């Protein structure tokens, strides 16, 4: 029905969201209405202003749904910019907090001068969470589900074979083959309108997500959404999205995640 029912803030036209502003996100989203993946990406429709601030007027991607289910799938095999490796090089900021997520999961991880600073770069941070999780190897993992019931679970630090994943949306779609087929449908038209997108050729899509909604009727959508780390490529070179990621190079090998993505839903549609 809506997301709103600490980014987001209830808008005042039905079936619309407002999102923090932010200068990527926006650039990316005014690109975005002019291009392929349009149809792909919530409905932008421009800034407004809420108690002295910028916010996204959105469509709320919730409202044709009757009681959504709801999964954040983050794409890319690289979910940091490459920026961040210069900055942790020239200028650590050393973080506490990321020590103790790290320790929490695995307590042999941190080296012995992460342990004695009790703090990780960023970079060292979100590369471990790539390894334990699919991003590494399939190039997408699991953040999120809201299920219909009104439960959540973030609780996928640790999802990581192709089959452990497939297991997370079998629960997902809890045996409704038309649900299943809709969503393998749309990934499939994603991915068409990926290859040839403009956009999508001549920008680095670093910590997006692919967002699958369904619902008891078996309406069952997904769009592209996060832009907020999504940056063009200097002067007109292209990424093929596939490619391994070596520092220098921006590949994100977000088309690397779809088609594995693809190949699992397609996979648990055959069980
Ligand atoms: O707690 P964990 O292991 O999930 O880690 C979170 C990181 O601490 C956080 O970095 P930050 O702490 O510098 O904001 C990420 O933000 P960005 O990568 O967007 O800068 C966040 O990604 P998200 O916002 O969820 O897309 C990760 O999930
Ligand atoms: N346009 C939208 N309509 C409805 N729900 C949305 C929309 N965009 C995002 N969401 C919800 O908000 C969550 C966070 O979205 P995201 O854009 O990644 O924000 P953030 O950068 O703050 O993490 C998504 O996983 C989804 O549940
Ligand atoms: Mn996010």
Redesign the pocket.
Known sequence: GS?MS???KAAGTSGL?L??CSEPERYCLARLMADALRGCV?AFHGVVERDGESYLQ?????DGFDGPC?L?CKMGVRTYLEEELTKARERPKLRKDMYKKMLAVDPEAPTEEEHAQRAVTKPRYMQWREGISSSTTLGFRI??I?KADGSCSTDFKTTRSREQVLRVFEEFVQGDEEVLRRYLNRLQQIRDTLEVSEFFRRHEVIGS?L?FVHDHCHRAGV?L??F?KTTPLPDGQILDHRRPWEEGNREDGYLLGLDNLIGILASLAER
């Open positions: 997301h600490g980014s987001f969201i999102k923090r919530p959105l469509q709320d991607l919730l709801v954040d953040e999120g809201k997500s967002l769009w959404i996060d907020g």
